Design a protein around this ligand. Structure first.
Ligand SMILES: [Cl-]
Length: 257
């Protein structure tokens, strides 16, 4: 890098935070990581994309030591870039989340009854996570359902209310915001799915370098500036982890019908 900041690739799948404020927040996060980890300022810089399709190019080009990706991107790229976890976020005491399929009250009693019906949600653009992980490989979403992707869970839930959609797959945060019309009910709750945090290329980092970054993130949410960043994303803390935390997901990821 010859004195330039080292790149940290951030593949932001999307979320409650708009792209521009999420990108700014990554820069702010790195400034806190540097302070709490006692790096000189501008040791790192964020290379940000909200496009899943560009994540791979950014990884190959920037050759980053550290990155932030979705679980699906990690599982797909882990072998090529010898990726290992650095930290997971803890949210509401848990390092995992559950997805809920909701539908108008009384219409459907199980997912099998939604076969051939139309599904909405914000995580439908990349349906291998929906099929292999959320549904534990019991359904092939593109074959068994009509996936109507949405960019905002509000849009999907409006369509459900109208009757333009039969059910909506919701994250924890989206399921919490439901209250804020037609009666609805949860038709399906996923198993616990681990949360992604930061990862590292183990061919480009030492174990001790990963540990320093991890420890910095473990203390980030206590910092005056870091606290506001963890609030923005609803994060309780970050926790350092070994690779086995995602081994159960790797088993689901390999399964095919
Ligand atoms: Cl996920």
């Amino acid at each position: 890098h010859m004195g330039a900041p080292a790149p940290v690739v951030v593949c932001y799948p999307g979320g409650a935070v708009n792209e521009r404020d999420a990108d700014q927040a990554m820069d702010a996060m790195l400034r806190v990581v540097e302070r709490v980890g006692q790096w000189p300022e501008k040791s790192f810089s964020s290379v940000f994309t909200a496009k899943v399709a560009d994540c791979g190019k950014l990884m190959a080009e920037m050759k980053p030591a550290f990155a932030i990706t979705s679980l699906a991107l990690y599982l797909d790229m882990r072998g090529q870039y010898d990726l290992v976890p650095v930290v997971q976020p803890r949210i509401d005491g848990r390092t995992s989340e559950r997805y809920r399929v909701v539908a108008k009250q009384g219409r459907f009693h199980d997912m099998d009854e939604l076969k051939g019906r139309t599904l909405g949600g914000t995580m439908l653009d990349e349906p291998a996570f929906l099929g292999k992980i959320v549904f534990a490989g019991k359904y092939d979403p593109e074959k068994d359902f009509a996936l109507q992707p949405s960019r905002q869970a509000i849009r999907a839930l409006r369509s459900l209310d109208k009757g333009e959609l039969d059910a909506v797959v919701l994250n924890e945060q989206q399921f919490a915001g439901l209250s804020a019309a037609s009666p609805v009910e949860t038709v399906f709750t996923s198993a616990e799915i681990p949360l992604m945090g930061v990862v590292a290329n183990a061919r480009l980092t030492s174990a001790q370098e990963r540990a320093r970054f991890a420890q910095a993130l473990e203390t980030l949410c206590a910092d005056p500036e870091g606290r506001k960043l963890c609030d923005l994303f609803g994060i309780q803390s970050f926790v350092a982890v070994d690779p086995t935390v995602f081994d159960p997901m790797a088993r689901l990821w390999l399964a095919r019908n």
